[PDB]
Design an enzyme around this catalytic site. Structure first.
Site, PDB file in Angstrom:
ATOM      1  N   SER A 179       4.216  -4.380   2.402  1.00  0.00           N
ATOM      2  CA  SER A 179       3.070  -3.687   3.016  1.00  0.00           C
ATOM      3  C   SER A 179       2.949  -2.193   2.668  1.00  0.00           C
ATOM      4  CB  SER A 179       3.063  -3.901   4.538  1.00  0.00           C
ATOM      5  OG  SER A 179       2.860  -5.268   4.862  1.00  0.00           O
ATOM      6  N   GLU A 181      -5.057 -11.077   8.068  1.00  0.00           N
ATOM      7  CA  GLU A 181      -4.028 -10.308   8.787  1.00  0.00           C
ATOM      8  C   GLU A 181      -4.624  -9.048   9.431  1.00  0.00           C
ATOM      9  OE1 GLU A 181      -0.708  -8.010   6.921  1.00  0.00           O
ATOM     10  OE2 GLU A 181       0.623  -9.584   7.669  1.00  0.00           O
ATOM     11  N   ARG A 226      -9.924   3.804   8.663  1.00  0.00           N
ATOM     12  CA  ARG A 226      -9.042   4.214   7.568  1.00  0.00           C
ATOM     13  C   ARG A 226      -9.698   4.214   6.180  1.00  0.00           C
ATOM     14  NH1 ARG A 226      -6.069  -0.055  11.113  1.00  0.00           N
ATOM     15  NH2 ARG A 226      -5.877   1.313  12.941  1.00  0.00           N
ATOM     16  N   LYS A 263       2.010  -7.965 -16.925  1.00  0.00           N
ATOM     17  CA  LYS A 263       1.265  -9.178 -17.221  1.00  0.00           C
ATOM     18  C   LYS A 263      -0.213  -8.953 -16.916  1.00  0.00           C
ATOM     19  CE  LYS A 263       0.882 -14.161 -16.290  1.00  0.00           C
ATOM     20  NZ  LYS A 263       1.460 -15.349 -15.555  1.00  0.00           N
ATOM     21  N   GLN A 264      -1.046  -9.147 -17.932  1.00  0.00           N
ATOM     22  CA  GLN A 264      -2.478  -9.250 -17.728  1.00  0.00           C
ATOM     23  C   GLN A 264      -3.082 -10.200 -18.746  1.00  0.00           C
ATOM     24  OE1 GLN A 264      -3.875  -4.939 -18.255  1.00  0.00           O
ATOM     25  NE2 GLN A 264      -4.599  -5.871 -20.163  1.00  0.00           N
TER      26      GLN A 264
END
Lengths: 244, 358
Positions: B166, B194, B203, B335-336
């Site tokens: 988080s 969530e 925010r 990774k892409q």
């Protein structure tokens, strides 16, 4: 490659071997966030014995002055009158160096020493806008208001990291309150002479007076605090009528 | 009933063999009429040579095979089925799911007898009898910087983010989707499970207005943040981002919920709650990869973790059909599914929730 840069940056301070010994530190230093989040601390290198540790107009903008009134820091040079040996024996060390200021080669600052009121800090706040034509993180500070809240404690491990090796430090006034200042500014002025840096001074008294006033007892810890402040430059007079 | 249909599509492409040559071989035939048909198909595209309906039918008339299948009547009915197209693969797997079995099953019949026939052996009767079984283009991520390597977030992908518990990825998965609804146009679907609807409003203003060194919870700030605010929520109406938290809606429901908006706005992005709170993963997570391909929406169907690849590729998929997979600690897009697989130099103030570059 980063090591090369750092090595020559602080080669005046580092003992080649000290660099390799504190390698882990210096590498961890560069690898982590060089910034903070209050803009709460930033990492800076410090030499502790044989080991190096890590302690935490459109011209006035990215600057970061400490413990000072908000808008008093606006001063120019045409507006600054040119008078006695208060202003006719100073623009000879100031202008020889203008667009020619290095790091990796120590520069000459100045020590404005004299009276109580004439013009202590008008030749450290005016030039802070010559350090605003190019824009440095130039620091301007009251040292009467610096040995008080940093005696306090809460947070105290690292409180003077912007009062050491910043590109510019226009120190103003020290006239209040074997001193509580020999492992403090006396080692702060140590990093201003081995990581390639100059500093700027102005106060109430003078070199002769301040040496006769610092750190008292029943110890030349009073006559070592002030040549850490008479090294990069030679102090010159301030004379003229009163301004109040 | 795969075999009756399977060849029908292979016909008119002329490239429905690229994955099909991978799936089915001359052993993959439960049937008897079909086995030699495909070998007459495979002989063609080896120059190749060209590819159409007939290039096989007169090939079959030649080297000993035409009545074997009951004339061309069923050779026609190889075609006559596929009432579909948008599947893609798919399809030949049905035959491979008639296949894989017996390469792992027909290989256990001899053994069932290698005890009363091979009487008489024992140990070598193991060493072999077990061996067989196996067989900007390109919508930016908000940046002006992440715009020249790959570019997009173009038109269809699957993305699953995994950084330390988080952190700013929590912000970033959504800070990908900021400069799209307000500062240009495209309304982007940012749904949650969530962090609720009453949890993602104060925010964004922390992230927008030069207001967060305060903070904003008390109701009233300092004599400056109210002189400097009209950035955070003034153009929120004329934008296109709104927040939901239908507790934890399943992999089919949101998949079936992004149909209200796909008709209404066109549906630009789907920033989902970590595909781990949604309801061992090479299965459950393979219902948001293909929703991107038909819905034509960038789908941020995420995760919750150091970062490393076959480490989120641990208990599940991730190193497979799943497309671009970046790595927050600096954006390590090590990774892409994008071409230029590389890291972009970044930073964070943490003072006003605004992140930095270099």
């Amino acid at each position: 490659q980063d090591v090369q840069a750092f090595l020559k940056e602080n080669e005046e301070v580092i003992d080649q071997k000290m660099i390799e010994k504190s390698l882990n530190k210096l590498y961890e230093y560069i690898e982590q966030s060089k910034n903070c989040s209050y803009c709460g601390y930033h990492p800076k290198l410090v030499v502790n014995g044989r080991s190096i540790d890590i302690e935490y107009k459109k011209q006035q903008s990215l600057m970061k002055s400490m413990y000072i009134q908000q808008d008093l820091l606006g001063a120019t040079f045409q507006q600054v009158d040119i008078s006695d040996p208060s202003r006719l024996a100073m623009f000879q060390h100031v202008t020889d160096f203008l667009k020619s200021y290095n790091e990796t080669g120590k520069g000459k600052g100045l020590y404005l020493y004299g009276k109580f009121g004439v013009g202590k800090t008008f030749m450290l706040a005016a030039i802070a806008n010559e350090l605003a034509e190019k824009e440095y993180s130039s620091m301007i500070v009251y040292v009467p208001e610096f040995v008080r809240e940093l005696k306090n404690s809460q947070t105290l491990e690292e409180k003077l990291n912007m009062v050491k090796t910043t590109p510019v430090l226009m120190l103003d006034d020290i006239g209040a309150e074997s001193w509580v200042r020999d492992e403090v500014i006396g080692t702060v002025l140590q990093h201003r002479m081995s990581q390639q840096l100059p500093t700027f001074f102005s106060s109430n008294f003078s070199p002769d007076e301040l040496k006769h006033h610092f750190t008292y007892s029943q110890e030349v810890k009073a006559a070592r605090l002030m040549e850490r402040i008479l090294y990069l430059a030679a102090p010159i007079r301030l004379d003229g009528e009163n301004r109040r | 009933e795969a075999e009756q249909a399977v060849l029908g599509a292979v016909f008119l492409d002329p490239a429905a063999l690229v994955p099909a040559s991978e799936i089915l071989i001359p052993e993959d035939f439960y049937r008897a009429a079909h086995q030699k048909i495909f070998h007459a198909m495979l002989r063609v595209a080896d120059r190749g040579e060209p590819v159409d309906l007939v290039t096989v039918t007169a090939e079959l008339a030649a080297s000993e095979q035409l009545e074997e299948i009951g004339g061309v009547s069923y050779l026609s009915e190889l075609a006559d089925a596929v009432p579909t197209a948008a599947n893609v693969e798919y399809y030949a797997r049905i035959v491979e799911e008639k296949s894989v079995l017996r390469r792992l099953i027909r290989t256990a019949t001899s053994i069932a007898q290698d005890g009363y026939t091979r009487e008489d052996e024992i140990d070598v009767l193991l060493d072999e009898a077990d061996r067989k079984i196996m067989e900007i283009t390109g919508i930016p991520t908000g940046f002006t910087e992440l715009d020249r390597m790959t570019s997009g977030f173009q038109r269809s992908d699957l993305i699953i983010v995994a950084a330390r518990p988080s952190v700013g990825k929590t912000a970033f998965a959504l800070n990908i989707a900021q400069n799209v609804a307000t500062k240009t146009n495209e309304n982007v679907a940012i749904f949650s499970l969530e962090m609720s609807a009453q949890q993602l409003v104060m925010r964004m203003l922390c992230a927008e207005g030069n207001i967060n060194a305060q903070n904003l919870r008390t109701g009233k700030l300092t004599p400056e943040d109210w002189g400097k605010l009209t950035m955070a929520m003034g153009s929120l109406s004329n934008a296109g981002i709104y927040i939901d938290d239908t507790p934890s809606i399943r992999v089919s429901d949101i998949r079936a919920k992004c149909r209200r908006l796909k008709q209404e706005s066109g549906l630009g992005m789907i920033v989902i709650d970590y595909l781990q709170l949604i309801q061992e993963v090479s299965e459950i997570s393979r219902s948001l990869k293909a929703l991107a391909r038909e819905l034509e929406v960038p789908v941020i169907a995420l995760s919750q973790l150091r970062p490393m690849m076959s480490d989120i590729r641990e208990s599940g998929s991730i190193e497979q059909d799943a497309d671009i997979v970046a790595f927050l600690y600096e954006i390590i897009i090590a990774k892409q599914r994008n071409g230029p697989v590389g890291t972009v130099q970044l930073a964070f103030i943490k003072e006003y929730n605004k992140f930095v570059n270099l």
